[PDB]
Design a binder for this molecule. Structure first.
Ligand SMILES: Nc1nc2c(ncn2[C@@H]2O[C@H](COP(=O)(O)OP(=O)(O)O)[C@@H](O)[C@H]2O)c(=O)[nH]1
Ligand SMILES: [Mg+2]
Length: 319
């Protein structure tokens, strides 16, 4: 997948937890499903879908607290993903202790992030439910008084790598809620355009813009209006022809997610400057095709698709 623009400061997803909690396994699930979104050089840092991922272990019996690391690592955190092995009840108190330490550190250096707890290794159809619940409740007993004092509202997920949709849904749903989807898609488009030297990129659903990136902001209104008119003249389920908005040529791919009897029609559009046409247009088309396939897949996790409701004002307020 595409690199992030190194002159830019992406938002971070922190994937934290005790050693053995399952985080590398969770990461690899995402990477096997969405390699097209990942810049792949055990890795502790990688770029994914317009975000920077930080995957760090804590605790255990080795000489365990090596995070107390430069301050830059706790800056720009927007998503705090914390993995808790609920089979390992004896380590739950240790897990909660690091959780609280890391939340306090993150609050010191990052201003506005949200918390997602992955209650992990809840393997499908298998006994163990009493222990799983006891571990989850013990974790919450340890962490909620502090969370409540700090006025967080964490989200709880229930995951297992042996049921990979649970992991894919937990990891992707936070990025694609109505409050975060526009920024997520916009940052993903920025990375996509940077990686192959495109001028701008837009994503639409039902002809409404849900993500946008422009290397020149002066043209946003003009291109957005022209794209709206172009899309409103297109029929369902045909290739979208290229067109020119001088000096740009714009290429569009369409994709669809059905929810019951209803379709959500999406469009992915990117622009090149005709006065500097890339030497390898095939590379751009092949990249767009692969990206579109994976965008369709990850957007199955958006609140839009999960509820079957396009809430324009909520998406615009999320910005
Ligand atoms: N039963 C079960 N084992 C898992 C699960 N996820 C990870 N593991 C196992 O837990 C061990 C630690 O996983 P790992 O991904 O290396 O954890 P990390 O130390 O947090 O990176 C490994 O043996 C994994 O195969 C899961 O969902 N269910
Ligand atoms: Mg690991």
């Amino acid at each position: 997948g595409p690199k992030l623009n190194p002159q830019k400061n992406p938002q971070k997803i922190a994937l934290f937890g005790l050693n053995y909690a399952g985080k590398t396994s969770i990461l690899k699930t995402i990477l096997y499903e969405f390699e097209a979104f990942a810049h792949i050089l055990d890795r502790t840092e990688l770029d994914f879908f317009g975000k920077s991922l930080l995957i760090w272990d804590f605790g255990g019996q080795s000489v365990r607290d090596d995070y107390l690391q430069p301050i830059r690592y706790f800056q720009r955190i927007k998503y705090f993903y914390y993995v808790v092995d609920v089979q390992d009840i004896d380590r739950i108190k240790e897990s909660a202790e690091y959780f609280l330490k890391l939340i306090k550190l993150t609050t010191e250096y990052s201003d506005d992030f949200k918390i997602f707890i992955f209650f992990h290794k809840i393997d499908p159809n298998y006994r163990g439910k009493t222990k799983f619940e006891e571990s989850e409740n013990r974790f919450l007993v340890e962490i909620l008084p502090t969370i409540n004092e700090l006025k967080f509202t964490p989200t709880y997920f229930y995951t297992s790598i042996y049921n990979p949709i649970s992991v894919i849904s937990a990891f992707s749903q936070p990025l694609l809620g109505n409050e975060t989807i526009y920024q997520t898609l916009s940052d993903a488009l920025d990375s996509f355009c940077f990686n192959i030297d495109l001028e701008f990129g837009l994503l639409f659903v039902q002809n409404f813009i849900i993500g946008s990136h422009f290397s020149e902001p002066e043209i946003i209104s003009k291109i957005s209006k022209k794209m709206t008119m172009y899309l409103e003249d297109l029929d369902e389920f045909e290739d979208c022809p290229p067109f020119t908005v001088d000096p740009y040529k714009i290429f569009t791919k369409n994709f669809v997610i059905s929810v019951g009897d209803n379709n959500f029609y999406f469009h992915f559009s990117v622009g090149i400057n005709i006065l500097n046409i890339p030497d390898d247009m095939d590379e751009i088309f092949d990249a767009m095709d692969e990206y579109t396939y994976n965008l369709r897949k990850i957007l199955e996790n958006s609140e839009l698709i999960r509820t079957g409701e396009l809430r324009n004002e909520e998406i615009l307020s999320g910005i």
